[PDB]
Amino acid sequence: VPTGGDDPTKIAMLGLTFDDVLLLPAASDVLPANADTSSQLTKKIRLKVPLVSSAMDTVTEARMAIAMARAGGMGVLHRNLPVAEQAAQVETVKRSGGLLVGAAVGVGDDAWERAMALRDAGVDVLVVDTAHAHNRKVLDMVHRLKTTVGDEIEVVGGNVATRAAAAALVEAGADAVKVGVGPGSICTTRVVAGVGAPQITAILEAVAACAPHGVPVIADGGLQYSGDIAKALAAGASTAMLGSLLAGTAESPGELILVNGKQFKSYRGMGSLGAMQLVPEGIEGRVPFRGPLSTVIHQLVGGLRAAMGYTGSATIEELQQAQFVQITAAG
Amino acid sequence: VPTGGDDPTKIAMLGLTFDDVLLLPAASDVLPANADTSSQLTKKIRLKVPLVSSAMDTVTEARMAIAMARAGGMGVLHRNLPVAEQAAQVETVKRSGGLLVGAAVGVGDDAWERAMALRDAGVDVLVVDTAHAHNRKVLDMVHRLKTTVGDEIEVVGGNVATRAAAAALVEAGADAVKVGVGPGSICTTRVVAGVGAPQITAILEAVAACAPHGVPVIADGGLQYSGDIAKALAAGASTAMLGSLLAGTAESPGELILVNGKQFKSYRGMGSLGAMQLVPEGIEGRVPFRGPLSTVIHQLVGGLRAAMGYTGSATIEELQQAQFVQITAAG
Amino acid sequence: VPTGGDDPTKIAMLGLTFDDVLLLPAASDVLPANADTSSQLTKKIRLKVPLVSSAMDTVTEARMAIAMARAGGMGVLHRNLPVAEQAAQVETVKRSGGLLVGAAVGVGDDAWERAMALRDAGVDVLVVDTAHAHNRKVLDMVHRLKTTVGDEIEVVGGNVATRAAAAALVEAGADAVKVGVGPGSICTTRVVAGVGAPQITAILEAVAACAPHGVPVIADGGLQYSGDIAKALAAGASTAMLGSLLAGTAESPGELILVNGKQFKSYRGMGSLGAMQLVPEGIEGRVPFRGPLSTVIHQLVGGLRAAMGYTGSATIEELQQAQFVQITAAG
Amino acid sequence: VPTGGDDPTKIAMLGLTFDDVLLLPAASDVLPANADTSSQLTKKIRLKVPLVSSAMDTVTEARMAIAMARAGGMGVLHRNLPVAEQAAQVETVKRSGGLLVGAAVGVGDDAWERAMALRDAGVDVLVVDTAHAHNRKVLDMVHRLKTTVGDEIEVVGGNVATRAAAAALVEAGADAVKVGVGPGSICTTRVVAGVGAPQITAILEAVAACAPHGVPVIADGGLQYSGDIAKALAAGASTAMLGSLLAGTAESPGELILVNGKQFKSYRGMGSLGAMQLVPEGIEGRVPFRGPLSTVIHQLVGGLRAAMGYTGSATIEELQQAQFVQITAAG
Ligand SMILES: O=C(Nc1cccc(Cl)c1Cl)N1CCN(S(=O)(=O)c2cccc3cnccc23)CC1
Ligand SMILES: O=C(Nc1cccc(Cl)c1Cl)N1CCN(S(=O)(=O)c2cccc3cnccc23)CC1
Ligand SMILES: O=C(Nc1cccc(Cl)c1Cl)N1CCN(S(=O)(=O)c2cccc3cnccc23)CC1
Ligand SMILES: O=C(Nc1cccc(Cl)c1Cl)N1CCN(S(=O)(=O)c2cccc3cnccc23)CC1
Ligand SMILES: O=c1[nH]cnc2c1ncn2[C@@H]1O[C@H](COP(=O)(O)O)[C@@H](O)[C@H]1O
Ligand SMILES: O=c1[nH]cnc2c1ncn2[C@@H]1O[C@H](COP(=O)(O)O)[C@@H](O)[C@H]1O
Ligand SMILES: O=c1[nH]cnc2c1ncn2[C@@H]1O[C@H](COP(=O)(O)O)[C@@H](O)[C@H]1O
Ligand SMILES: O=c1[nH]cnc2c1ncn2[C@@H]1O[C@H](COP(=O)(O)O)[C@@H](O)[C@H]1O
């Protein structure tokens, strides 16, 4: 073995991230303005725009969930607050029309009662929200929800970063699998635990377990540019979940911050010291202020539409078949 | 598959850019001062110097086209202005002697009338000027021009970055194929759409489709140093098109700018907000002021001549047979 | 041979460092709080926490050795002082309870008398402390110690960075093998001599010689983050030795330094000019002040515990079987 | 072909530079202080220290040549001055004892008379001094010198960077071959012409042609640290030529410069505008002031001695058999 020892499987793969690849142009009859951007969030739910907002207390409360739904995507309400308050944010969203909404739950002792209160409030999607879903307690929660409320509610499980973990969630009955262990902009799991998986390779592996069973993959974390959305979907994901890219919008929670003559908003990991209030796996930081959500979403979808034009992809299902070129450090 | 999934073709190639390679020295009888730098721009047109200026409104209007022709190259007049004005710039150039000139046209509804007005003005070369030529509307335009005015005018099509796209332009009747999707200094297509192709690999692939049919390749975008001209031609291109490297010259349009005691000129993408006046795929920037064009061209051709000496290349056709070494990040 | 010459063995391997790899998540029944972090320092000695402090005069004297033992690890007392003084630091530690302690010795003419004085003082571990253990004088010292005092004292030999060197120490009778030639934060051997071996590959190679003989490997140098501890142990090491990461603690020797409104402590190589008082192979630098040792160790072990959770490793022996993904520059 | 086109030989090799490799430690009986650092400069001439100074007008005139010889190496006098003046510097050196000295000559019309005047002055080594020796005029000059004055004078030819070019100089009768096209610290050939060859690979290739014929290789350019000397010799070179590393010494030509409270000396390429007084292939820069030559040489040889200890190399001939590990960007 060229890199050491006598076991070829010790270093199991070469992991690529978004910056390691570009989409190749292909024969096209598609105008960007005419592409169909709709895609499956879950087995039963299709969104007009393939984007959802992170379940974080500096990204998604009621106002963000309403704006995301109106723009054709969806919000996932965070769970760092009392059960009755999260349930009330669900009703606030449903009171603003027939708008789709999701909400996060954990696997702790209070997680089941939270899930039932969210169901009573009319939630459309429950997200079993963990850092490591390849675990019996998490698989059991997904299965119990699906068997109990699965006719009226779609159940998402995550997060995973390997083929085997994605396969286990499929078997447990997940309606979608969420992919991302380590890639987030505010994540320190890579340096604190030494654990992670570059996202392009993680998506390719998860899709190999999920697509043959008709289960959509949500790419969660590490997306820095509108072009990364196109890359994640071409690797086989059906939607992307965004934190940093939406945290700078007017609709996110938290105050406007002025430093050195420039405007920012606070953005913090749910594993940071501040959010937990210990060995933190996130930081508390800030992102540039970007203006209204509707305008940010227009620009992000605009980049996706351009990629669909260059690759000849009339639908997101066609984009999932596009090819990459791998690039070097120089490029 | 070491990088993920079960499909070896998903990541189709490893793409190299100019900074990834160097030309290897070889046995030589050639003095730099005695090399023959002439090369085919198109099937019928041979230039004394293998260089043309970009069709951009901060690079090429009448003054630049006149200076480029006198230096032994050619200018391509931009199309971001009324038809009658572009046609008048063509006549201005022809009034300064028997000087070669080209002009860009699109594929929109007004593109045919623009092309006919340019023909009436005495243009030598028409460039069908798009970001993605692998498309029936673009192929149809190239073919219609060649069948209509092709006896008196040479027709260039572009841009492409794959073997299959280059092959389609050849079949449509192109007299030259222009290569470059994503590499430009002011380009944001890579980050906005996630689309592109590193230029050395793009040129190697396009040449594999074009050279067997006797059709010259124009390398367009990403050239930062005089040494990159030699690299592009050794990869098999016949000429190079330059934007950033000529935008700082006296003959380019736009004002001299003074910031922090240093002189600059404005340089902007044709896909920037300013040029289009939306999801922009270019930026508005600036480049250092470089002085007269004739002097810049002397230095660029001087570097090319040095490469021809080191590689034993008496002509550009011989340089197209030179070999590379691939280098690492450290180098 | 693609990289030059006709000998495939001239460039013998591709060496990976900690930053080149991440640990992959795996199926897990393990909670971080419930993992067993105990591990073999030597054939006979098992520590509660798999960490020891460097034998350096800005890292480990009596106070550090006492604090390390109380936290469940061990200190190795430096040898840059008179024999009678080092022996007295050993007794100081033993006077603070039944605490484990080690001490460094060289291979010079005074090394044997130093070793005997340390034995008389009640030392638990002798570390034969060199930059290059693949040498007859060093192997002879290890063997002579083991045959003379080996029933009551465990003998460590180092440092090495190849399979063959580790194998030689095993044959000589070492109770543990210490790995690291070139990787230290304050090391200049790589630039002064041009010699070294990236640590992940060095650990994989040393373990291939040591594990089949039941001899533990100590990973020494280059560890910058708590996550690097998990990586070193997963590559097959049984403990890690830390210099820079503990030099900023209250218990290390040396004064608090204030520069630009920030607090630091001095940290210097044992091969720096200052420590030797010549061709130095270390620098004299500084590290940020970090507070009490007990608190730093809590955070480091916290990161290790997180890695054990993500990888499903109930013990350090299970962690030694975990898998890596290799990452690129971009990642 | 993964990187483009259909020709596997177009990208002929992967080129490594000094920063891409480290020397692996090996079994050793060698103390650094006891290593034998002597090595062949040419077929007949052996130096006590394997180092020579560059033929540059900011590195080597009489004073530097005298100091280099006394330190056990040799100086090569530059040729950017009148013939009678260069010949007088040779006699100045010979007047300071029985000291070895070399001098550069070109291949222009005045080169033969320069060579004869240097011979009359008592020069020991003539260096045919070009940027590209794979050329009939250069090969003819080497052969004519060897056949005319070869009994009393050793003849060096260079520079080359390929196996075939080195082989041609051997056939022409060279007593040593000098390797380096593009690597120098003040070189811009890589960016101006796009031509070069990373030095480790260039040395491995040149040695494959020269060592079977008993002809020594001089590694010229790109050496930045004392450790790079050990790397060049392990790749198979017999000596190293130094420019930047000796330009900062008291004995080099040119004035002490004070900028921002720090001391520097001027250092310029022989292809810079200033030296030629045009398309320059070098820059005019500065290096930190380093003090007396004897002290710099002591430190450089000290690093070499350390490498010989780590690798078990008793002589330079043994060091030429040492092995490398290739490292990544991270390392
Ligand atoms: O429950 C947790 N750890 C834990 C507890 C018991 C067993 C096991 Cl195996 C584990 Cl891993 N944590 C620690 C990590 N965080 S996090 O930083 O906020 C975070 C949240 C969501 C997505 C993440 C993706 N990758 C990194 C971290 C992410 C959630 C709470
Ligand atoms: O017509 C366009 N897009 C478009 C419209 C309809 C269908 C399709 Cl498939 C597409 Cl791609 N655009 C957007 C890009 N720009 S550009 O940025 O100014 C530009 C111009 C020329 C060379 C380019 C090389 N690579 C990147 C961009 C370049 C031209 C106008
Ligand atoms: O004894 C030494 N050299 C020496 C003497 C005789 C023969 C031989 Cl083969 C050698 Cl290598 N030295 C020089 C290096 N240092 S050091 O920098 O302080 C140092 C100490 C411990 C771990 C090291 C890991 N890698 C680099 C250097 C390290 C110790 C003293
Ligand atoms: O004679 C020259 N060029 C030339 C003239 C006629 C034919 C041919 Cl094939 C060539 Cl290449 N030059 C230009 C380069 N320089 S230089 O920059 O000062 C220089 C000097 C020595 C070592 C070099 C190593 N690699 C790069 C450049 C180096 C010498 C003068
Ligand atoms: O504290 C944390 N540490 C690591 N990952 C987190 C943390 N908080 C949230 N995440 C995840 O990071 C995603 C956002 O990543 P981003 O879009 O790159 O900023 C979220 O959707 C979570 O999956
Ligand atoms: O706005 C833009 N975005 C991307 N590419 C552009 C744009 N405008 C012009 N180009 C292309 O970039 C080339 C110039 O690249 P440069 O020489 O690297 O600056 C031009 O000839 C066009 O092919
Ligand atoms: O001066 C030196 N040069 C090279 N290595 C040293 C020196 N002093 C100590 N070391 C080694 O570097 C280790 C500490 O590395 P660190 O934890 O990365 O700072 C020590 O345990 C020694 O093995
Ligand atoms: O102007 C120049 N351009 C390129 N190479 C040069 C020039 N002048 C001298 N050289 C070569 O660069 C070597 C010095 O390289 P250095 O030791 O890295 O600074 C010299 O011995 C020459 O072979």
Q: How far is residue C211's CA from residue C203's CA, in Å, rounded to a whole number?
A: 11
Task: Say how far apart CA D93 and CA A79 lie, in whole Å.
Answer: 84
Subunits with 3+ C-beta pairs closer than 8 A to C: A, D
Phi, psi of C275 (to 5 degrees): -70, -35
D302 CA distance to ligand 3 middle (Å): 13
Contact B14 A325 (CB under 8 A): yes
Instruction: Indicate which technique resolved this structure.
Output: X-ray
Mapped onto helix, strand or coil, the DSSP state of residue D195 is: strand
Which one of B5, B162, B182 has the shortest CB-CB distance to A204? B5
Query: How far from each other are the two terminal CA atoms of chain B, in whole angstroms?
Result: 29
C310 touches chain A (CB under 8 A): yes
Residue to test with chain B: of D9, D163, D279, D327, most B Cβ within 10 A: D279
Q: Which two tokens stand for residue A298?
A: 């227009």
For A228, the token pair is 């990364």
Question: Which residues in chain C touch residue A196, judged by CB atoms under 8 angstroms apart?
Answer: 22-23, 325
Distance (Å) from the C-alpha of residue A133 to the closest C-alpha of chain C?
9
Domains of chain C: 18-326 (3.20.20.70)
The shortest CB-CB distance from D26 to any of C2, C15, C134 is to C134
The answer to whether D187 is annotated as binding is: yes
CA distance C62 to chain A (A): 29
Half-sphere exposure of C294 (CA within 13 A, CB side): 5
Q: Which of B201, B236, B331 lies at the smallest CB-CB distance from D198?
A: B331
C139 Cβ under 8 Å from any chain D Cβ: no
DSSP string, C75-108: EEE--SS-HHHHHHHHHHHHTTSS---EEEE-SS
**CA–centroid distance, residue C35 to ligand 7 (Å):** 30
Torsion of CA A61, A67, A70, A76, to 10 degrees: -30
Q: Measuring from atom 23 of ligand 2, which residue has the nearest CA?
A: B131
Confirm or reject: Cβ of D159 under 6 Å from ligand 4.
Answer: yes
Extract the tokens encoding A262.
Answer: 């420039």
Nearest atom within ligand 3 for CA of residue C183? 25
Residue nearest atom 3 of ligand 3, based on CA coordinates: C131
User: Which residues of B does the annotation place in the binding site for K(+)?
Assistant: 182, 184, 187
Q: Is there a contact between B51 and B40 (Cβ–Cβ < 8 Å)?
A: no
Nearest to A324 among B12, B165, B168 (CB): B12
Catalytic choice (A62, A169, A187, A316): A187
Closest among D253, D275, D276 to D265, alpha carbons compared: D253
Using CB atoms, which residue from B15, B207, B324 is nearest to D12? Answer: B324
Question: Looking at C65, C160, C168, C187, which residue is catalytic?
Answer: C187
The CA distance from B205 to A286, in Å, is: 44
Q: How far is the CA of B313 from the centre of ligand 7 (A)?
A: 53
A159 alpha carbon, distance to own chain's centre: 9
Q: How many pairs of residues across C and D have Cβ atoms under 8 Å apart?
A: 157
- Type of residue at B226: S
> How far does Cα B271 stand from its chain's mean position?
16
**Tokens for A205?**
């592996």
Chain D residues near residue C206 by CB distance under 8 angstroms: none
On whether the CB atoms of residues A104 and A127 are closer than 8 A, the answer is yes
> How far is Cα A263 from Cα A257, in angstroms, rounded to an integer?
6
B92/D306 Cα distance (integer angstroms):
72
With b meaning 16 or more CB within 10 Å and e meaning fewer, what string describes A267-297? bbbbbbeebeeebbbbbebbbebbeebeebb
Q: What are phi and psi of B178, to 5 degrees?
A: -105, 130
User: What is the CA(B150)–ligand 6 centre distance, in A?
Assistant: 27
Q: Pick the residue of D169, D192, D225 with the most B CBs within 10 A to test the interface with B by mutation.
A: D192
Q: Partners of A12 in the beta sheet? A: none
Q: What is the DSSP string of B106-167?
A: -SSTTHHHHHHHHHHTT-SEEEEE-S---SHHHHHHHHHHHHHHTTTSEEEEEEE-SHHHHH
Ligand 3 binding pocket mutation candidate from C132, C135, C279 (most atoms within 8 A of CB): C132
Hey, are the CB atoms on A14 and B3 less than 8 Å from each other? Answer: yes
> Looking at CA atoms only, how far is residue C1 from chain D in angstroms?
8
Are the beta carbons of B324 and D136 separated by less than 8 Å?
no
- Residue A169 in contact with residue A146, Cβ under 8 Å? no
Nearest ligand to residue D282 Cα: 8
Any D CB within 8 A of B152 CB: no
Q: What gap in Å lies between CA D285 and CA D281, rounded to an integer?
A: 13
C278 Cβ contact partners less than 8 Å away, ≥ 6 residues apart: none
Q: Which atom of ligand 5 is nearest to the CA of A222?
A: 18
B305: closest chain D residue by CA: D193
Q: What is the DSSP letter of A25?
A: P
Q: Chain D: residue nearest B231 by CA?
A: D194
Backbone angles phi, psi at A301, to 5 degrees: -70, -30
Q: Is C187 a catalytic residue?
A: yes
* Residue from D118, D117, D140, D142 nearest D128 by CA: D142
CA of A179 to the centre of ligand 5 (A): 11
Q: Which residue out of B16, B127, B145, B187 is catalytically annotated?
A: B187
Of C235, C238, C270, C233, which Cα lies nearest the Cα of C131? C270
Q: Which two tokens stand for residue B49?
A: 């110097």
* First-to-final CA distance of chain A: 29
Q: Is A182 in the pocket of ligand 1 (CB under 6 A)?
A: yes
